[PDB]
Nucleic acid binder design. Structure first.
Ligand code: DGT
Ligand code: CA
Length: 579
DNA sequence: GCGATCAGC
DNA sequence: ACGCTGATCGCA
């Protein structure tokens, strides 16, 4: 029902200077994954190519790598990385339908061509799940069915580029697609393919030491409980704490007793078993998520882990990191931080270099709210978390402990993003009236932030959405809901999304500028990871001194705000030593 | 499969 | 009853 050539060899009319291209990788993790078929739609017609012929054809490989042969695609990073694993470079991607749909409305959750096409009343393509199936029944269909599906996706990309670009233009997002998200997609492809080297000997040794510490703590828990149980059984654990030992019940879940760490910490005066349960959970989290989980995904021959940065998933424009998630590697507790000693440079005599924005969301807030006092604080390069810690605990600067500062950091973000006196009192273990008076004093120091937060909620009600500094958009239909709780969540999204999303925009532009600068200086240094407000690179030891001046400057100059941007940086022999 | 939990930002 | 995530695991 759609005409196409099931081609046996590559022809010159397949290599036009503008085409929709489909390079199909069905496996969810596309690293080293098979390419199961290729489709090309252009002015001369529609073509399906088998990969084992197309990707060994030197003219087709040449066409893929030619920047001047422009390709429209959906999820071009998936294609670029799968091709890198075949030794083939993809260049010239000038339109990515996945990123275009994500920019127009992140809430759509668009994850295949059919879902994007449905945004523009295009329905002549099937969902990928309808073609490949679900779960244990998932499979590549017979060639004619596959070929028609890939050609139909290519034809959809071909037809949808103009209406998508037109809507992007009306939203002031066309440069956001073409100058920011699409260039970043190629950089992420390089980072994912490069991978991060892991010291598996060290991780395995930690895993063994962890397993015996686990056993010890576990016996102590059974000892303190007077019996044995499944410490991870909510029913049994709840039964132990709140029925056998008769500890107060401070919180319930939909299903029974809460045993979250904040509850257990509040029960510490009542019984020393809860501190052991906490320690046990923390150890088991390291063991199962970061020891076993990381060893499971390491490529054995290179000792590299290859994350996938999801660029079209979060509602604020942040990236996420999957399989493994390299944006939530422990750092907070010393036992957990040592996991980072296992993350090492990929060559000998190279080092890890890490640079991060200091308080970028609060600096962005000061700029957007034009709050006189908050702008002055950052113009003085004040550490607002220490200053808040001094006010909370009524101490002087040198008397601000690391834990006090971490607490004040959650007070700072909490208050500007709408925490209530109740939530603040519960976090600081102060009276609710004290917490409310503190919040009042906080907005007396920062009335521009208060005004901005009231204004942005009203702007979302009027427009139906909020935007970031680089014109990312989030629709907030619930902000006019009649249910108070549904409305309130939407109001806090209107307060938070433009700030968190603008900080996401800035670091993305910084990455693009950084790569252009590394290329211009002819450095071997390259990005490995982004962790929201941090960039992690590796480079020859002999490049570190140049990177100490280059990277912070690139990051600080990514945008110009009414307050300066501030970058801290470290380097060392492992990721551990680079912070 | 989902909710609770917890690791990061 | 501040926000944004992903992985594990028990299932009340
Ligand atoms: N709403 C909220 N956001 C947070 C919280 N903690 C971190 N974030 C987000 C906001 C920012 O995008 C980013 C900043 O967190 P960081 O740990 O990097 O601390 P920050 O830069 O504020 O200070 P520091 O690095 O310690 O000088 O992470 C929090 O408790 N609540
Ligand atoms: Ca930071």
């Amino acid at each position: 029902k759609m005409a196409f050539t099931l081609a046996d060899r590559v022809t010159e009319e397949m290599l036009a200077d503008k085409a929709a291209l489909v390079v199909e990788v069905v496996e969810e993790n596309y690293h080293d994954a098979p390419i199961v078929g290729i489709a090309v739609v252009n002015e001369h017609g529609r073509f399906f190519l088998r990969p084992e012929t197309a990707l060994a054809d030197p003219q087709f490989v040449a066409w893929l790598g030619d920047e001047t042969k422009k390709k429209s695609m959906f999820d071009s990073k998936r294609a670029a990385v799968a091709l890198k694993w075949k030794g083939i470079e993809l260049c010239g991607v000038s339109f990515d339908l996945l990123l275009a749909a994500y920019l127009l409305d992140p809430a759509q959750g668009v994850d295949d061509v059919a879902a994007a096409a449905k945004m523009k009343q295009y329905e002549a393509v099937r969902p990928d799940e309808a073609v490949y199936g679900k779960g244990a029944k998932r499979a590549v269909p017979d060639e004619p069915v596959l070929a028609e599906h890939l050609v139909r996706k290519a034809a959809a990309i071909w037809e949808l580029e103009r209406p998508f670009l037109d809507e992007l233009r009306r939203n002031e997002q066309d440069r956001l697609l073409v100058e920011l998200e699409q260039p970043l997609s190629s950089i992420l492809a390089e980072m994912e393919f490069a991978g991060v080297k892991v010291d598996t000997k060290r991780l395995e040794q930690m895993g063994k030491e962890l397993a015996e510490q686990l056993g010890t703590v576990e016996q102590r828990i059974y000892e303190l409980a007077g019996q044995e149980f499944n410490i991870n059984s909510p029913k049994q654990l709840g039964v132990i704490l709140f029925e056998k030992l008769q500890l107060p019940v401070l919180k319930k879940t939909k299903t029974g007793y809460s045993t979250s760490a904040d509850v257990l910490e509040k029960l510490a005066p009542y019984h020393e078993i809860v501190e052991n349960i906490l320690h046990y959970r923390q150890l088991g989290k390291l063991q199962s998520t970061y020891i076993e989980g990381l060893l499971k995904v390491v490529r054995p021959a290179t000792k590299k882990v290859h994350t996938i940065f999801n660029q079209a998933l979060t509602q604020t424009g942040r990236l996420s990191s999957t399989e493994p998630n390299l944006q939530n590697i422990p750092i907070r507790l010393e036992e957990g931080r040592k996991i980072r000693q296992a993350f090492v440079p990929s060559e000998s005599d190279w080092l890890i270099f890490a640079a991060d924005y200091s308080q970028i969301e609060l600096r962005v807030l000061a700029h957007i709210a034009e709050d006189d006092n908050l702008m002055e604080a950052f113009r003085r390069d004040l550490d607002i978390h220490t200053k808040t810690a001094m006010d909370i605990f009524q101490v002087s600067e040198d008397e601000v402990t690391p834990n006090m500062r971490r607490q004040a950091k959650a007070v700072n973000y909490g208050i500007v993003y709408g925490i209530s006196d109740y939530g603040l009192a519960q976090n600081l273990n102060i009276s609710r009236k004290e917490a409310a008076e503190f919040i009042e004093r906080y907005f007396e120091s920062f009335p521009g932030v208060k005004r901005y937060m009231e204004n942005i909620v009203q702007e979302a009600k009027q427009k139906g959405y909020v935007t970031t500094l680089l014109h990312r958009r989030r629709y907030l239909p619930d902000i006019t809901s009649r249910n108070f709780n549904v409305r309130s969540f939407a109001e806090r999204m209107a307060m938070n999304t433009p700030i968190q999303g603008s900080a996401a925009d800035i670091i993305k532009k910084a990455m693009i500028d950084l790569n252009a600068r590394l290329k211009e200086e002819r450095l071997q240094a390259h990005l490995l990871l982004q962790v929201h407000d941090e960039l992690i690179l590796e480079a020859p030891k002999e490049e570190m001194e140049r990177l100490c001046r280059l990277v912070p400057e690139v990051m600080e100059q990514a945008v110009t705000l009414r307050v300066p941007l501030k970058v801290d940086y470290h380097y060392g022999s492992t990721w551990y030593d680079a912070k």
